Design a protein around this ligand. Structure first.
Ligand SMILES: CCC(O)(CC)CS[C@@H](C)C1=CC[C@H]2/C(=C/C=C3C[C@@H](O)C(=CCO)[C@H](O)C3)CCC[C@]12C
Lengths: 240, 11
């Protein structure tokens, strides 16, 4: 049931992802060193991680079939609002349920609840973020469904500030239909049961997580002393 | 608007 165009879209997104996600995590040595002792001792390190991660999400977004056809302004709005959501999604790849931490190669680059706490966040975000990681992980998505979900997340018509929502909605739909059809043909039962409905629900959880993250980000970014520890990109995208 | 760097990364 998978058309030629849809098998093409999946080939594009898989490649786009592989070029923007290094599973060896070699670049992490460039980030400011993580400090585990110390209020906000992990902020400089994770700030750089996110800033790096924003760049990679942009690189992935540009390769989403149809994304280029949008105006630069709509491109900006979609990325600016989806960025944290897509980073939370793509982070699932390093998240292990063996201890509820993001394991990126080494112990120094293994991050858990307390590390995020020392980044300036409360449990009001961290618990549901882990809950999300656990719930997403238990879906055991095919990498094909993983990359489709991130693209569908990026191209959401309902983002505040979008102009040509019609075009955005036509890009996303073509992606939804590619995902739905893929689940039917390539994902065998029972793991395919309600699979699409459960994936869309994750986009709902991400909206809530985004809303909560922004709230806490503004509180942290309010003190110029903390705002200093961030990067110019993170400031530009997450707001000033 | 006001996004120099994000605009540049989008080529
Ligand atoms: C420092 C404050 C700030 O709110 C904003 C700059 C972020 S903290 C918190 C909200 C948060 C979200 C993604 C989480 C995590 C992401 C992990 C990643 C590792 C890896 O899977 C990855 C890329 C590999 O290159 C992802 O892009 C990001 C785990 C730790 C905590 C991280 C950073």
């Amino acid at each position: 049931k998978l058309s030629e165009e849809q098998q093409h879209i999946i080939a594009i997104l898989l490649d786009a992802h592989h070029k923007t996600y290094d599973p060896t995590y070699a670049d992490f040595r460039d980030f400011r060193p993580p400090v585990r002792m110390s209020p906000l001792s992990m902020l400089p390190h994770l700030a750089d991680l996110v800033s790096y991660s924003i760049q990679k999400v942009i690189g992935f977004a540009k390769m989403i079939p149809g994304f280029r056809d949008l105006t630069s302004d709509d491109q900006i709005v979609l990325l600016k609002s989806s960025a944290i959501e897509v980073i939370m999604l793509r982070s699932n790849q390093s998240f292990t349920m063996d201890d509820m931490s993001w394991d990126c190669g080494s112990q120094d680059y293994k991050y858990d609840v307390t590390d995020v706490s020392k980044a300036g966040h409360t449990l009001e975000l961290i618990e549901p973020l882990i809950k999300f990681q656990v719930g997403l992980k238990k879906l055991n998505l095919h990498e094909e469904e993983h990359v489709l979900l991130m693209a569908i997340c990026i191209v959401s018509p309902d983002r505040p500030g979008v102009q040509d929502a019609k075009l955005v909605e036509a890009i996303q739909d073509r992606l939804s239909n590619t995902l739905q059809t893929y689940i039917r043909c390539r994902h065998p039962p029972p793991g395919s049961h309600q699979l699409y409905a459960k994936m869309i629900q994750k986009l709902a959880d991400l909206r809530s997580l985004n809303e909560e993250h922004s709230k806490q980000y503004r509180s942290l970014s309010f003190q110029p002393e903390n705002s200093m520890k961030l990067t110019p990109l993170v400031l530009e995208v997450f707001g000033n | 608007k006001n996004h120099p760097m994000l605009m540049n990364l989008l080529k």
